Amino acid sequence: PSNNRYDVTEWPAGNPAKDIGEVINSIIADIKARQGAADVDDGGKPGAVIYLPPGDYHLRTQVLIDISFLRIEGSGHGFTSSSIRFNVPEEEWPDLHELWPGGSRVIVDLPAGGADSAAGAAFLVAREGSPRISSVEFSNFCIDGLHFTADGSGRHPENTYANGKTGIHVASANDSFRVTDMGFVYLENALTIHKADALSIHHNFIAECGSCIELRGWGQASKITDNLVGAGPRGHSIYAENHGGLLVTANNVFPRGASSVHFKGVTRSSVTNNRLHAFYPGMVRLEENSSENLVATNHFLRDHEPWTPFFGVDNGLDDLTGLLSISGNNNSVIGNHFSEVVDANEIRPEGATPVIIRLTAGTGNFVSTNHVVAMDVDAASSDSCFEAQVDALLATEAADLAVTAVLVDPGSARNTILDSGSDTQVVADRAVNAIRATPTVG
Amino acid sequence: SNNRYDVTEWPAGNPAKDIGEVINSIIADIKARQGAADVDDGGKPGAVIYLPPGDYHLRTQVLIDISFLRIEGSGHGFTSSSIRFNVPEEEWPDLHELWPGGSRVIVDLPAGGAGDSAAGAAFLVAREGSPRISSVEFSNFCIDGLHFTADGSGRHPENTYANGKTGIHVASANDSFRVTDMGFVYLENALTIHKADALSIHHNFIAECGSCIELRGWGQASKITDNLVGAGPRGHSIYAENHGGLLVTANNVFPRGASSVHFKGVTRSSVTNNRLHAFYPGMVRLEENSSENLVATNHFLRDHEPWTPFFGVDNGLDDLTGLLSISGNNNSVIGNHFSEVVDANEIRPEGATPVIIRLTAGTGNFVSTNHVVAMDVDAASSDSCFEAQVDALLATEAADLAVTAVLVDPGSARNTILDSGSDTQVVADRAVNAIRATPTVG
Amino acid sequence: SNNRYDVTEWPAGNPAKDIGEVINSIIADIKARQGAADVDDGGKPGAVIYLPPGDYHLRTQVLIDISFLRIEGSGHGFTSSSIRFNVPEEEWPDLHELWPGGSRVIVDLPAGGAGDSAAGAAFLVAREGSPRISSVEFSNFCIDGLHFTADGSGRHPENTYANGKTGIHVASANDSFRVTDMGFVYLENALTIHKADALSIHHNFIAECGSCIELRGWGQASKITDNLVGAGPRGHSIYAENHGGLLVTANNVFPRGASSVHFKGVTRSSVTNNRLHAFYPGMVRLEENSSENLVATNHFLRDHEPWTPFFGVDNGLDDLTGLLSISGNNNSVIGNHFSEVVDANEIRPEGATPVIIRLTAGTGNFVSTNHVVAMDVDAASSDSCFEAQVDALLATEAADLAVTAVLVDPGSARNTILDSGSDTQVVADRAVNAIRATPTVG
Numbered sequence A: 001p002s003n004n005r006y007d008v009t010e011w012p013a014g015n016p017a018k019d020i021g022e023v024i025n026s027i028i029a030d031i032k033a034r035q036g037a038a039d040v041d042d043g044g045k046p047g048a049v050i051y052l053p054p055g056d057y058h059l060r061t062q063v064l065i066d067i068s069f070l071r072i073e074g075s076g077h078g079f080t081s082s083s084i085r086f087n088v089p090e091e092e093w094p095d096l097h098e099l100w101p102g103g104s105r106v107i108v109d110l111p112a113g114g115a116d117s118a119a120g121a122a123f124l125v126a127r128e129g130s131p132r133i134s135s136v137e138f139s140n141f142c143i144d145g146l147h148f149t150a151d152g153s154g155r156h157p158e159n160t161y162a163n164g165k166t167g168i169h170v171a172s173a174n175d176s177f178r179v180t181d182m183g184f185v186y187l188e189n190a191l192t193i194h195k196a197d198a199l200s201i202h203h204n205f206i207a208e209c210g211s212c213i214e215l216r217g218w219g220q221a222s223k224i225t226d227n228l229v230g231a232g233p234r235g236h237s238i239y240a241e242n243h244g245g246l247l248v249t250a251n252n253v254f255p256r257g258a259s260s261v262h263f264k265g266v267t268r269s270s271v272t273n274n275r276l277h278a279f280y281p282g283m284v285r286l287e288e289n290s291s292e293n294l295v296a297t298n299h300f301l302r303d304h305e306p307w308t309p310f311f312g313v314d315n316g317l318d319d320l321t322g323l324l325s326i327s328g329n330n331n332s333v334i335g336n337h338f339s340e341v342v343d344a345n346e347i348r349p350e351g352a353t354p355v356i357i358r359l360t361a362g363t364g365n366f367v368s369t370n371h372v373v374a375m376d377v378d379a380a381s382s383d384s385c386f387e388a389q390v391d392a393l394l395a396t397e398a399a400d401l402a403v404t405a406v407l408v409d410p411g412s413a414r415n416t417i418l419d420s421g422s423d424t425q426v427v428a429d430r431a432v433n434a435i436r437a438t439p440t441v442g
Numbered sequence B, C: 001s002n003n004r005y006d007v008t009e010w011p012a013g014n015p016a017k018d019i020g021e022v023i024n025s026i027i028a029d030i031k032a033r034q035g036a037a038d039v040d041d042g043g044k045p046g047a048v049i050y051l052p053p054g055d056y057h058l059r060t061q062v063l064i065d066i067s068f069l070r071i072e073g074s075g076h077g078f079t080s081s082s083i084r085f086n087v088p089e090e091e092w093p094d095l096h097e098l099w100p101g102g103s104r105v106i107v108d109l110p111a112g113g114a115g116d117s118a119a120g121a122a123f124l125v126a127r128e129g130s131p132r133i134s135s136v137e138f139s140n141f142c143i144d145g146l147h148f149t150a151d152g153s154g155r156h157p158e159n160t161y162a163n164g165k166t167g168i169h170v171a172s173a174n175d176s177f178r179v180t181d182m183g184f185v186y187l188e189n190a191l192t193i194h195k196a197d198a199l200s201i202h203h204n205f206i207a208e209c210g211s212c213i214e215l216r217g218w219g220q221a222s223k224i225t226d227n228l229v230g231a232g233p234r235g236h237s238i239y240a241e242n243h244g245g246l247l248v249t250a251n252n253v254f255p256r257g258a259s260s261v262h263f264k265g266v267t268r269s270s271v272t273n274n275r276l277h278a279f280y281p282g283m284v285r286l287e288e289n290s291s292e293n294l295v296a297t298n299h300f301l302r303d304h305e306p307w308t309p310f311f312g313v314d315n316g317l318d319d320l321t322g323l324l325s326i327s328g329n330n331n332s333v334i335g336n337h338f339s340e341v342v343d344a345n346e347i348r349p350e351g352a353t354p355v356i357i358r359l360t361a362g363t364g365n366f367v368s369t370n371h372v373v374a375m376d377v378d379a380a381s382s383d384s385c386f387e388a389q390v391d392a393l394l395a396t397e398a399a400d401l402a403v404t405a406v407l408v409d410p411g412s413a414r415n416t417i418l419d420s421g422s423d424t425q426v427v428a429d430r431a432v433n434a435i436r437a438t439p440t441v442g
């Protein structure tokens, strides 16, 4: 209508329970048809808002967004742990108050994306030419990939993090986009945004997805703030490639992504003031000439998976990789806390000492004022999920455990390492690196 | 039917008389319409209940016992009832307004009795069995407890921070809850959440409540971000117990709580990048084996109350307590700024050297690169509230004051203390602690 | 009425022609209906005014003089008018769109007078007497000043950053105000707030405005969080005067303000965890006795404008000014990263050594653990804006550059400077300051 407000439950000849995709595409076509003029009275393509009330909507056709200033919003992120529910024995399902996620819920009933993943996306944002598509907003709704499927391993289907489905895929260059207050669940990829400028991914709940946030191709001046993020052992929690000026702060990143923050070729960016929890090494990775980044005042925790269905599932990386791994130049690693809480039996390779910060290549890295705390605890598992997670998080009964605080590989040199471990805990060629050991008691 | 309600558009009850009866009725209708858990891959998506701006009296506790329920308004509606009530009653006809506004829930309940304080809660979220109640959302409305009452403290009744009333009380284990954009005023307890997993308390205005945010029992992976917080002298600003992986960041905490942030049993969490202003000692307390927490890049200011009605009111603690007090192991205290701005005469006990960081118990704590700044100022009093608060904040005309930057009690040992004060400013056994004094001039 | 208004459903006037007349008409209707302040514990709860997506010319200033008024939209609606206005005019018909959109207020007010810029403000919040106007809210709409105009500078009219228009001007003392999710574009001033208490400016997109955020007169306990900010070269990005307890964090500030953050007489405030990018020196300025401030874990990038229309334009300041410049007492500068990426041939004065941190006046400042990285690069020009910006942000093809990491002027003394540069990099009197050089290997 003329005021550009739409409700998917109030669309003529549209049934959002059967196919919300069709309904939203139909609304998009109506907006285009009504907003054909670009320069009438200094305006004419102001866009529109499409509202989703709380409800269970099945999406069977991909939504194509190719207009600037489109807001899609609901009234609930609607998360519940489908992982937990699928691992509760089936005979107990009748006793459960509810089984599925809710809120303003888009169920992605698309076939898988193979041979690229874009075709498995609920929402695809694509438009080439000039200007770059701008200020699209997604807010406060839920995107549910429903089931994970078998992939060839022995594992249960619902625990593979594989289904070919994506929540939102932005394929073209974009400016001033927003994703806020969303729920994403049970999607192989929650949110993939290519070629992003001044994007804000703020205050979402992105969990039980193979991969959560992926910033691809390149980008600039973006920020990932205030999110709650949990990915899968073969995927990324927060990933970026070729970004400049990215700010990653105030996220609570919990397991079980392969990593917490993964950068390839990321420069002049900040990963600061996050809480990072992982069950595997390689929590924060600065790869392929990631340079001039600040990694500051983050809380790193690495311990063992305490929940039986994923005990013995891992990211294929050994404890020599590091919690923080750097390949590149002129980074600053300041004021971080590292808690390494592992069973001395569970260490790989056999009889190795864990590495916390590892510099594999590059020059001029500044590492200063980082506190490393290490503890030996035996790795219990039980079937009761949140009970086991909270019991393991709060457990402080331990021997001490030896760790390498900072390892500088010979392929990295001219680094500066200050108060980030005792002389023992810093493994580095002193002739080509400035080292100041943390003073010990004596 | 599309799961969207408006309290001013419901047949039963009257939102102005009893908004609680109206909301409970809506919840009954949601339960009556959403009776099945597995029809076409959903069936309990929840709902949204809207509070237009208005003055709504609540006489019946609202019981929330469904997942995916959102309650939202169009206004946080704060004004300082505290100021208003300390303006002579004679002048109240002269004021543009007297009460809070916005989407306002006026809590007219009787006091939280001899059974429990949960019965004083405007909103009680509780459900037992499985799964945990999930993704309930509270957004952009006001909860006003209207008056404080005499509690046997002899201060004017409106200044007691006592009425047995709670804003939102969550009694059961919960997952993915959200409290955003809210206003809480004149409640003995604004927000008390038991047993929270992955909670977010984001961008709220929680002021002039006896206690503001309390995370009780236990929890994991939650976050308290971007909030404006002001509590009362016997209560908590931000409190948490047996939490693992909590992130408290980007909050502006102003007086006059007993504390700014108070932890009991909290592990592997982060209190980073907050602004903290207190009128008393014990601003940040890590108690009862609170271990492996990062306390980083916060700004602490502790000065004297300038407002006459609370001039002589305090938290009962003496200047030897600390601005930051730690009882626990392996914590990291890094990059914090401490401004101590007191009258030297009023220092308690008399002639004491005020303590700033105090390590009362535990081992392995890392205290590095903290800037202490201490000042002696004449403590003024005034009835013109915000005038006197701003003046006090801006006044630096002052003499330099001797303080103990870090005090390690004999019961704490093997701590590391770098660049957080001179040798005189650090009181500690050097034989069992590693101390490097901030380098001196020259 | 339930205090909910829609500007496209109002009987008088035309929001496409004059949204200001419509909104003022709604405001008068609120005041007429809410005449009493103490009827049933309430009476003036305020209201919400909703702007659907659309193009709305404003010709009459809106005057807001009631508490608890919320003005909300469904789109921040940013597009780069700057890019578009530097596309040849004859090509404009073939662009997908030209203008900003979303919920768009176009400010068609004639330029603000010499005496006061409040008269060029689209929204003016102003009311004297007691109490202070409280809890006004601006959310998720777009304010567009449309054109920049010729100002004598000889630059193209659309690149001058001058038109005497303001988005939102608050003249009067205020409490608990909130400005969230907005889009501001093409205004000489985006947001000016006098005398702010407990203000939150959160998650806004404030770009291509002469000045973006200015907190004037005085203020306290306020915060500026999670904003994307780009100003003009004669203006401020974030500015504050006579504030105490200001928290500035998690903002991604891009060019091209005269500065990123500028304080005058600001005390006991925190400028922490921001990503700051400038094309000019003088990025962060603490002036006129800015004391007891924390400036921590920011990422500073300074480089050369790469977009042709502004390639020769600067803020008037030379490379001896410093990226961070301090005039005041007892500040803390901890854990920041500075990238200085400039052409040796374009340094001014000729063959000067660029300064990174400058202490011009005051005593007791603590500077610790700052990583300075400096590079000789030739950022060339391109006519294609977002292309030039990404290329320059990711280029490290770069020989090394000598810089002064910390300069202490003789008018400042008794500072402490640790691990913030080598002995060559610290230009300061060793007799009167405490200096620990960053260890080097040599």
Ligand SMILES: OC[C@H]1O[C@@]2(CO[C@]3(CO)O[C@H](CO)[C@@H](O)[C@@H]3O2)[C@@H](O)[C@@H]1O
Binding pocket: A080, A081, A083, A084, A207, A208, A230, A231, A254, A255, A256, A385, A389, B175, B176, B197, B198, B220, B221
């Ligand atoms: O912080 C725990 C949060 O994570 C849960 C709890 O359990 C899960 C089960 O798959 O395991 C991982 C954490 O170990 C999470 O990715 C995932 O989802 C949310 O149910 C819960 O909100």
Ligand SMILES: OC[C@H]1O[C@@]2(CO[C@]3(CO)O[C@H](CO)[C@@H](O)[C@@H]3O2)[C@@H](O)[C@@H]1O
Binding pocket: B079, B080, B082, B083, B207, B208, B230, B231, B254, B255, B256, B385, B389, C175, C176, C197, C198, C220, C221
């Ligand atoms: O920082 C100012 C904020 O504090 C006020 C100002 O006055 C109060 C008591 O009425 O003093 C305390 C601060 O010292 C606050 O808890 C409280 O509320 C808000 O009016 C205001 O939002």
Ligand SMILES: OC[C@H]1O[C@@]2(CO[C@]3(CO)O[C@H](CO)[C@@H](O)[C@@H]3O2)[C@@H](O)[C@@H]1O
Binding pocket: A175, A176, A197, A198, A220, A221, C079, C080, C082, C083, C207, C208, C230, C231, C254, C255, C256, C385, C389
């Ligand atoms: O990339 C960040 C922002 O940059 C733009 C495009 O670039 C501009 C053009 O005038 O130049 C400055 C940055 O160098 C920004 O103030 C401005 O606005 C937004 O289009 C973009 O959102």
